[PDB]
Symmetry: D2
Subunit: 497 residues, 4 copies
């Protein structure tokens, strides 16, 4: 296969995953079948071990893998369905080698990091690159590998050593390395400094990989004198020093890379047989004037992106105002902030988790303000109506054609969406609710779990057990989120017509 | 506790384990309770995964741990009984952290090498240092930690980072580092080169540990000009540059270290409240003239050491001539080497394993030459008499007082020795042999396994199921090995009188 | 002596020289005699080799040394008079060792970087620290050594190796290291990243120096979670992690360091027997409302600082608008910018160099707007009146008591100021001017060079051959600059009364 | 041009200069014009600064350059005449850049190691490679550059950075790197260790150069398992792992390299349009039985080599027994060693320097034992007969045809040989000697200095002012040395016939 490693320098928050995902959609626009692998040098096996504050949200894959939000960036940019083994971690590879050792698979030889851990990385990358990750069963052409962390962190040392070897245990026609690095810009002088990028490239080149492209991330576009220092000290041509400055949106990052001519580089280097929409979406995003103010009651990064996809599609600006449920709760300055936000809420969003959510539900229910409840927001909705693990892709069957979500999903009798919940509605008690305004509208194939609710005597009050955020992509807004913004702007009855 | 790290430079075969074990017996001669821990940066969990060619023999511990022969060096020098967790490996620590992660013991935080793997090393070292490893239940005073590998190998990087932190997460009064390094001596010029030791100390000091002692291993004693270069370039006083040259025996290495005044250094540095036998044994070893030629039919390092302990005790030189059983086998130049060695064999030794052993057994049996069979050498002896896992410490009961091994072990009704076998003698068939010359003399407490055989109509033909090698120490020769050399020299009937 | 090394991490523009100069004035406020040495790892011998665009202005010392502007920061903060050998460079030290080699001073031994270049650094630092650099002939107590560059640049490697050795070839009571490092703050998230500081401290600690204080430079004050990561990963206590954020002025940086308690650290560590004005000047600077707009017709950093000292003393804000003389020149958008700036010029400043300066002189002369000409601005003033190396400290004698500059300098018959010029006024032609409005008012002791001019029929049009900028300090504004701001605000005749 | 860098790993005494010189004579046997440059990272400018104990003898070049003996190895192997600038040193390059800086040749830019010192290395290497260093005025085809020191020493860091850049600022067709490294062989086990070579290649590859050949120096030929570890861990094919073991002679080292097929590698890699004598000389050397015992009364490495060239040519073994003149002196165990050696002296050799030499002269003179005096040995000979700087190539004119040295040099009226002396014979006093047995036979063209003496009433007692050692090569023995061995074996009168 053809392989593109993306390494990071100086600091991890430079957006390497957006760059890597951007080059993947560039290559896809050039007609290529692109895979992605993310290396996360953490010793954790799956992101289910994390808090939402640590690594952002737990993105959920079709196979039930729990991963950090950057596999959602590859899914959203490439329109791809990743498997749990497209995330490589140090825990996953060390445990693999330890298990092989105990099985005698290393034939009584001493197991050690080089070669055995480095071979495990190569074995895994070669095979997961070949996985059909598009819906097309045809073997991929390119694999973009993001090496997470910063080159020079101790946890990354097996992977760069593996990738050093992988140059030679392949061809230069088949492997290149992108180094993404911070070019810090000083306050008082405006001066862009190249020293961290030079030092990071020196470290990377000391690990036996050379930058084939250097991607500068900078606050402002870099000056030619700055690009000249980088091309001289990092021993790469000026045409191989790319600048991605702070832009308006992720839609503009692929467009910017065409305007740095990366396709000519990848054609020449990787010997490749080679956007519109990203321009259009960027150009639209920069012109969004009509505010839709929604109350959310990187912890919710797919939720925010799903709303922005929906907002863009209806040519509105999202104003996502985040409210803690403890602010709305009876426990008082932040109460008069939170409830004031909840007054100017055109829609209420109660996402998942593991108290004032119930008050926001009551507010939305009573005042007839548009509501989307996801996972816990469905369960709390059922609960508060009464007062007044299941992991990965599953089929949800609609119990009727008289469903607003069914119209938004395109009249289909069932949907396949991603789940992540341990708790569900009691099958014996459903007959308390069916008599009244809260219809249970979607169920599993087993008929035990109700998985969608709709409140009938309301513009749009829906609850879903699945996370339809993980299915959201710019080209196809997540229908439960689209319905929320359509309802909040009154356009729902025009769309459903 | 007080801690002594022993790091290695340039190459691992410099004898760091003998140096570390030597300083342990020095400190023990100074009256201190000494523990040992060995770090082996391999990803293997236990040495049962190894061939005998890889890491030498599998030493067996009382608890059934399978470890490399260097935990036998700490056992033999200190008269200590190590536990399986006095061996630290990368596999054992990474699996520990992975298991803690999956249990949620890191409270949703990202697990990473620093701190979490480095803390696991510190946690383990602090607690295993406190283990009563002598028979005395009193908590130890010093722990000698040998860091296996060479400082600068990638697998060693978590451990040196842990030990860097461990300086500061302790006191300088409680931690020091010994660096053992090759001083190569060139052929043509006789010139001793200090450059590898300087470069290795620069690497070690780049990992945030400084040599408190530098132990030069050299072929010849080092010149003062060589010691001056090391003390200048490695930034350590001349009194802290120790030379251990190629000596006669391991008995001389502690004695040499007194003659480099290390006790004064450890008294001053570690604030310690502070040999004869090692001199005596060294002085004896250098005067061994009477050859006992024994045929063995680092793969057998405890076997060789057990014979040398026995040889020294009877003031004989061992000539251990190693013969492959395939040389003795019918499959022919090496046949006339092997059988010629077997002709001048004063004793035959058939150690354990997993064909010409049977011929050597037949030879020894028929010609009435002294025989010791260990594990497989007992099983093949039973088999060839007929023609003509159980792991760690177990109690073997003697079935009679009429046992030669029972006299050698001191008339005791049972012995406790170390086992490592999956196969044993059939309890139904023992009644074929008891009628004849092959007595089954030792059994387990269960009475199912016969564990010792003695052939009655022979000077000394014994078979044992245990490995009594692992019990051998210079002060107390292993009785089955002592019996072999006593028999082979005719001194048996004088000893047993 | 007591020594404080100040090392830099990530990027050089973090202000290490202001931090180092700030701790020097802190220690001086604590009553200590402080020296400064600046190491510049460039191979250049003196800054006379530089353009003004490269390293900023060439600061001139009393002995005629040409140095970068950071020796002016030590002069301005400490009220000190540095010698040319308080600047150490790689060129100065390598040439020293090469010269010693050729003289046989190394006694036929091979000269090499360690030890001989590292010893040369130590020799130089020990002796220049002892230099009376105050006017007091008493030997100094502390020496602040700024190591220029970033730790990990190849040119800095001799100096950090020297300073590693210098810890041990001294006492910990007598040496400490401050590491100044960038904590980059990301745009989108507001997130302060500690990774470069951790990596830079790892590099510094790999060169055998540990941070005794870590000084974070950040745009905003750092959060406690950020300070905790630094104190954990850089293995230093929280009290040793200092934050200097972007402040109003250099006057506030010493004041901030008291509010980080550095005096307690230096008392404890360096065993020291231990501001008001800096608070007052900072507090004043933040309240400057009255604008004095001056046209200047880091290239002029002492000029700008001299104006700011003058501005602060008269409680005005300086608006220094910089105009290129080529903009004012007949060669046209920038002409209407430049001449528009020159219209709102309350004073014209024509500093030194090596064309529209003559037009600005004519403008100021004719319209009677306050003028200060320095070096070339005196020579061009003489020239344009007619139309209508001498290096370091020299004595200039006033030819009369009827001098405005003589009143501003305190009625004294001569002044001693710093010179840097190859050209001077023709002694035969002076009699053309003395007849008219342009008096030559200051001369050298030789009587050949006129060194000050004053135009009599004007509020304030003075020219000086010396650079009185280099003499400017916050406590004592440079009288030619003070006169300019006093004239420009009309306060001159109140001051001279 | 084509360039071959030769780097060293682990320790400098591995013989890199003999390897580099050997590949140069291989390429010369393939018909190529070969240059050599030696980089010595010492800060010394010329070896005239050294003692003879430090870097061995001072080799003298035709232009009067004073250099270490390794430029004599390139002269002897290639039959080449090196210039003083074929030795590059850190002193020579830093002084060059400092001088350029002071001249303004860097146009006011900050001079720093990268680029300016690294460019100076490249500039120098490119131009000195083009120097006609053979007598043929045609521009060379290959330049062998030995980088002295060990890769990873701090002084070598500018040169490896220059050579990293030089790969890219050339072509792979035009540059390759040979890494020479110690494979230490342990005493007790016979085990050859690859770890230092792996670590040294990791350091070298961290400086951005990869081994194109790895030359193992080992005591014994390396095993295939050892070559496999090196080829795996150093990421080079088995055919690129060369072993040079301890051999009989330098004559065998080129022959060994053909038997490792290096010409096939250099043909393929450097795109080259491509021994007998070295085999013959090696084969002869191994069969030398007839001892010629000569008393010498790396300090004298060209002297020893000149004797060995002479010995080989007359098919004798040299037994060069070295005697200190202080042993022969009246100041007594070593007296009876020294004079005993002087009794079995078939020839006396008194080489140059700066007391018992006079006694050895008297001994040789009186007993009529063959004598060669060089420089000081001529001056002391003149002196002791009476009792009983001029640097580089100079023309010496023979005063007569009646000269034994003139016959040995081939009847020529003058010779051109290399000089290094400050003292000479007094022109007024020569008329004391000419009357008697000591003829002055060679003079300079000036007629002031007598430069050769011959004692007439003796088999062979010659003194020369020049060092004819530096002219010695295996193909053409130095005639004054050849005469000594011919005289000492009685073959002189057969040769001179
Ligand atoms: C939330 C929003 C509106 C967005 O653009 N935010 C934003 C804005 C700017 C940048 C940015 C600025 N400069 C540089 C770089 C980098 F590239 F260098 F890092 N990034 C990053 N994220 C959005 C809608 S859809 C989406 N993401 S998404 O669903 O994956 C879809 C793309 C496939 N985000
Ligand atoms: N210092 C300056 O401004 C230099 C002025 C002028 N070029 C001279 O040499 O006198
Ligand atoms: N080269 C030498 O042997 C030197 C000889 C003597 N010291 C001189 O200067 O002439
Ligand atoms: Mg810069
Ligand atoms: Mg040396
Ligand atoms: Mg972080
Ligand atoms: Mg090995």
């Amino acid at each position: 296969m053809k392989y593109i490693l993306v390494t990071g320098g100086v600091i991890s928050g430079i957006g390497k995953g957006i760059i890597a995902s951007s080059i993947g959609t560039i290559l896809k626009s050039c007609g290529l079948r692109v895979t992605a692998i993310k290396i996360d040098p953490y010793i954790n096996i799956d992101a289910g071990t994390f808090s939402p504050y640590e690594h952002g949200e737990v993105f959920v894959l079709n196979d039930g893998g729990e991963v950090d939000l950057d596999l959602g960036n590859y899914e959203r940019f490439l329109d791809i369905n990743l498997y749990k083994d497209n995330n490589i971690t140090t825990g996953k590879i060390y445990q693999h080698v330890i298990n092989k050792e105990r099985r005698g698979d290393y034939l009584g030889k001493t197991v050690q990091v080089v070669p055995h851990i480095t071979d495990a990385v190569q074995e895994w990358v070669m095979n997961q690159a070949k996985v059909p990750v598009d819906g097309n069963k045809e073997e991929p052409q390119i694999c973009v590998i993001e090496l997470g962390g910063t080159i020079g962190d101790i946890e990354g040392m097996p992977f760069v050593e593996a990738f050093r070897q992988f140059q030679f245990k392949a061809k230069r026609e088949n492997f290149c390395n992108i180094h993404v690095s911070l070019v810090p810009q000083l306050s008082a002088t405006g001066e862009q400094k190249t020293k961290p990028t030079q030092n990071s490239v020196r470290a990377l080149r000391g690990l036996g990989l050379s930058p084939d492209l250097i991607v500068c991330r900078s606050s402002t576009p870099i000056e030619m004198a700055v690009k000249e220092k980088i091309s001289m000290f990092c021993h790469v041509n000026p045409e191989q020093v790319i600048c991605i400055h702070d832009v308006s949106s992720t839609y503009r990052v692929p467009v910017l890379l065409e305007e740095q001519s990366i396709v000519k580089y990848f054609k020449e280097r990787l010997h490749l047989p080679i956007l519109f929409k990203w321009r259009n979406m960027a150009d639209r995003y920069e012109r969004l004037q009509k505010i839709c103010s929604i109350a959310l009651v990187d912890c919710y990064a797919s939720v925010f992106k799903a709303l922005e996809h929906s907002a863009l599609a209806i040519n509105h600006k999202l104003n996502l105002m985040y409210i803690d449920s403890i602010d709305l709760e009876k426990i008082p300055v932040k109460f008069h902030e939170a409830w004031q936000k909840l007054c100017k809420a055109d829609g209420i969003l109660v996402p998942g988790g593991f108290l004032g959510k119930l008050q926001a539900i009551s507010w939305a229910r009573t005042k007839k303000i548009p509501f989307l409840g996801v996972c816990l927001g469905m369960q709390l909705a059922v609960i508060e109506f009464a007062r007044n693990m299941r992991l990965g892709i599953r089929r949800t069957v609609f119990k009727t054609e008289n469903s607003i979500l069914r119209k938004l999903y395109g009249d289909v009798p069932f949907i396949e969406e991603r789940h992540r919940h341990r708790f569900e509605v009691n099958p014996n008690l459903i007959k308390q609710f069916e008599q009244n305004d809260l219809s249970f509208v979607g169920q599993d194939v087993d008929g035990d779990r109700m998985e969608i609710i709709e409140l009938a005597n309301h513009p749009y009050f829906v609850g879903v057990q699945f996370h339809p955020e993980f299915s959201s992509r710019p080209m196809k807004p997540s229908p439960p989120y689209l319905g929320l913004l359509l309802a909040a702007t009154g356009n729902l009855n025009a769309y459903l017509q």
